[PDB]
Every structure is written in structure tokens, then in C-alpha cells.
Design a protein around this ligand. Sequence first.
Ligand SMILES: [Mn+2]
Ligand SMILES: [Mn+2]
Ligand SMILES: [Mn+2]
Ligand SMILES: [Mn+2]
Lengths: 296, 296
Amino acid sequence: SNEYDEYIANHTDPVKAINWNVIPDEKDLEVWDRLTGNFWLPEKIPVSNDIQSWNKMTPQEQLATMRVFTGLTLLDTIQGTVGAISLLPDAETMHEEAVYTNIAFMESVHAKSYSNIFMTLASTPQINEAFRWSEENENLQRKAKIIMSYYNGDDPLKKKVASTLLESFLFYSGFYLPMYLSSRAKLTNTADIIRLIIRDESVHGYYIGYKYQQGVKKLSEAEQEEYKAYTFDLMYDLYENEIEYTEDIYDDLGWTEDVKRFLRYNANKALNNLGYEGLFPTDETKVSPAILSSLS
Amino acid sequence: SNEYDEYIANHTDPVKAINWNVIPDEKDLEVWDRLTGNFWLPEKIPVSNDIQSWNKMTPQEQLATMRVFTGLTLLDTIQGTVGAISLLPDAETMHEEAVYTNIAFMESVHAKSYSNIFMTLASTPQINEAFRWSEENENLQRKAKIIMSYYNGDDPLKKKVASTLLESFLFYSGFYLPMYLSSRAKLTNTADIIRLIIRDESVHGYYIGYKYQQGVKKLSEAEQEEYKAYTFDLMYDLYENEIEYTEDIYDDLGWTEDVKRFLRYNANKALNNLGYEGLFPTDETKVSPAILSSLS
Ligand SMILES: [Mn+2]
Ligand SMILES: [Mn+2]
Ligand SMILES: [Mn+2]
Ligand SMILES: [Mn+2]
């Protein structure tokens, strides 16, 4: 009766209902239609049909798979419960806020999809060892905490930069494995789930980056230069850390050199989403056409 | 020094990836399965088939519909972009956090559903006048700001109470109209959308209410009695404000008395969702049979 009187006295402007009949930025509606039109749940893909394929894989291949998927789960958990949500208060339109709520939910769907895969293919000990490894891996924890330091900060623009780098770059050291296996006719149903996830992340990265550019272009030329400097500096740090993460996961298998090229290819895409030129020359980003297609 | 060095040192515990193979509270999984299994979009309902019955409605009915729907849109806008989200930080389990991301998203689908209805049935001036009315109505703004004062507060249990009361009580002064109209062959397709929303809100209130109960039972004797007193004080404050809002919406139509019974009926259900006895004797909650039948 009184507890809320102060709040009411300090918020005299009307609270407004979202009006979808009036859209000041057409992009918000285009992305909302795209994302909602692409709704899916992991229960829709028959992962159990990969059991034979999975049992045929070597212990090294299985271990690499558990670790990359656990790393991916951690990134989705962060993005869904902390990332997308941190973007809400800095939205330019109410329709953009609505889009972020869809992004948050689909991230939770993504994270859950990995457990569906594990629960269908792996043993309890394997699952347990995997989650423990993710808590102890220094590089995985470092990339997670670097991104979270920005979501927990007070610069709306840095939150969008961190979010775009996460969505367009950090997931890729992990996405290489299922896409490559898929090109060898292995774990094909699991790859279908991975493609649905990529189809979402691609749009998330594109959209959040678009919003970053709109905000940064409102600043002076000098300020804009500082944000670009910050973006590239953050990319150098994430790349350095991802290289070590990659070596540790893929050295046994011997896939490391190709995964590093894949990292550089996507790092360029991530920068492009933020409106900047790529960092690595094209000749250093070669990706197998069998991966690029099964990726799409 | 890296801008994130300190944050990494102020957060030693590892960041954990959600694991759906280990569920500390089965209710979280049960609710995630129900909510995700109930996914829907307003585009799936053929609202255009209601065009004829809409034009048949009286000026008083159309005006009441526009206003009630805008009020509902306002409440969904708040629940989706501020409410569900404010619950994340105090979740007991990570699976509970996932459920809130789905609730946030579906609240945005609910808000958009009303705009889909408007755009299909109403004129632009009617839509514009409705949103302006919602901005100027003191009772609607009052209930919205009271709820938001708790979401912006620092007491996690109060946020849950405010949320359950909004989901199990504040929506009903509005849900009454489409249920009344559909029993009289008016806006029957629009009523199918309303039922899908109610199907979601009934689970939301049941779930957030359940989490409130778990949390409050972990407190001392004095604190449990204080939260109970707080809950009844707020419920009465909200009911009082709702009476005024209801009279101003339905007096011209003359449906007010039956609507007030519906309010008392749902207020008791909301308190039951929070583990408490109802506030109104059963005999004061006898809504006409036609209304409850329409909900079925
Ligand atoms: Mn994701
Ligand atoms: Mn994403
Ligand atoms: Mn709703
Ligand atoms: Mn709800």
C-alpha cells in the first residue's frame, strides 16, 4: 500500500504495451519471423539411430566428442541465462526486446539438445567425466569468464560485441567435429541437430551485430575508433585462448591444423557481423567443401 | 592489465554447463516438457474467420474488446521483458532458469497474439485509440507499476508473489470478455487463442507459486508469517484496484457483477498457488456457468 509508493512517484512515464502494428525497425520483424518460423526441439531428431555409428567410433573420437559438446553446452547455458538477457535493457525498440526473449529460450533449447545426445549415446561415467572436465579446463573457463565479465559490466555496446563474438566465433572450434564426422557418414542424426543450432546462431550473430553497428554509428569518429580497437583487442585474446583449447581437444586425432583454419574463417565472419574487415587473409582460412556444405 | 582480469579473480568457482541428466527437482523437467510441448504461434489460428462476427458486435462490445486486449498486451509485455527475467538470479536450480527463458519467450508470443487479432479485425484509429487509452488509464498503469516495483526490487520471494498474482489473477478481468463472447458465437477463433494463452498462464502461476512455497518454507517462524501477511496485503491492494478497472471496462455493457465474481474466484486460486487459503468465501465466487463452460 506504501512499499511501492516511492517507485511509482519516481516512474511517472506510462508503461507501454508492445504494438506490432507499428514497427520502427523492419529488421526486428524480419528476424522475429525467421527465428520463430525456425522453432524446433531436439526430441524431433531421431538421435537413437546414431547408436551403431557411435559404438563404432574410437575412444579418442568419443572423448573428443564429449568434450566439444560439453564446451558448447556451457556456452549456450551462458548465452541463454546471462547473455541475451543482459541485452534487454539496452534495446532500441520493444520488438527488439521480444526477439531477445526468443534468443534466450532457443539457447536453453540448444543446451538441452546436447544432453539429449549424451543421454542417448554415452554412458553415465562418460557424461560425468565430461562435465567435470569442463569445470577444470582452464581455456574453457577462461573464455566463459571473459564473456561474462562484459555481460556483467555496464557498457551496452561491449555486451553486443562479446555476444556476437560468442555466437559467430567461440562455438566454431566445437562445431567442426560434428560437421567433419557428418562428411564421413558418422553421427548423421546428431549433425542434424547441430545444423538446426547453427541455423539459429547464424541469425543471432547477424542480428546482434547489426544492433551493435547501429549504436556505435551514433558516436563520434574518435569513439568509434576506440570501439573498433576494443573489438580487435578482444578478438586477439579469444583467438589466442581458442588455439590452445583447440590443440588440447584435437591434437590426438590430428585434426588441429584444419580446425585452426576453421577458427580463422569464422573469426572473419564474426568481425564482418560487427561491421569490420576480416582479420585473417583468405588463403589462411581454407575450409573443406564437404564441411562448408554440410554446414550451410 | 586486461579489463577482465579482476572479474576472473572475483569469480573462482567454475562456470557450470547445465546437465539434464541430473535433475534435483523433477518438477522443473515436468514443467519444461509441458510448456515446450504446448508451443504455439498466433498465426496458426484463422482469426480472419472472426471478421464477420466482429462487424456484428456492438460499438460497446468492440470498444471493451480493444481496451481489455490492450490491457492484457501491457501485462504480457511486462511479464516477458521484466518479470520472468527478474526471476532468473534467484533460481534454485539451473533447470528452473531454463524454464524461465521459455516463460519469457511465450509471454512475448502472447503479447504479439493480441496485435495479430487487432490487425486482422480492427481499424488503425481503433488500434491507436486503444494504446493511448492504456497509457492514460490510471488503474491499468497503477497495477503495472506496482508489479514492476517488485521486479525491480531486491527481495526474490516478493518477485515470485507478484508474478503468481499477475499470472493467476490480474489477467482474468480481461479473459472474461472473450469467454463471454465465444459462448454467444462471437470471436470464436480469437477465443481459441485466449485458451492457448490461459493454458500457458495456468502452468506459469502454478510453477512460480510452487517455487515461492519451497523458498518461504526455508525461513524462520517470524519471516514465514510476515511473507504470508505481505501476500494478503498485496492481493487486497490489487483486488481493490482491479474493481475500479473492471467497473470502468464493463459498466456500459452491464457485465460487471459477473466479472467481479470471476475476480474473486481467480484471486482464491492465485493464493492457493502460493500455498495459502483463499481470501473470499466460496459463496462469493459463483461465476455464471456459461463462463466456466467456455474455459472448458
Ligand atoms: Mn546456441
Ligand atoms: Mn545464439
Ligand atoms: Mn502471458
Ligand atoms: Mn504467463
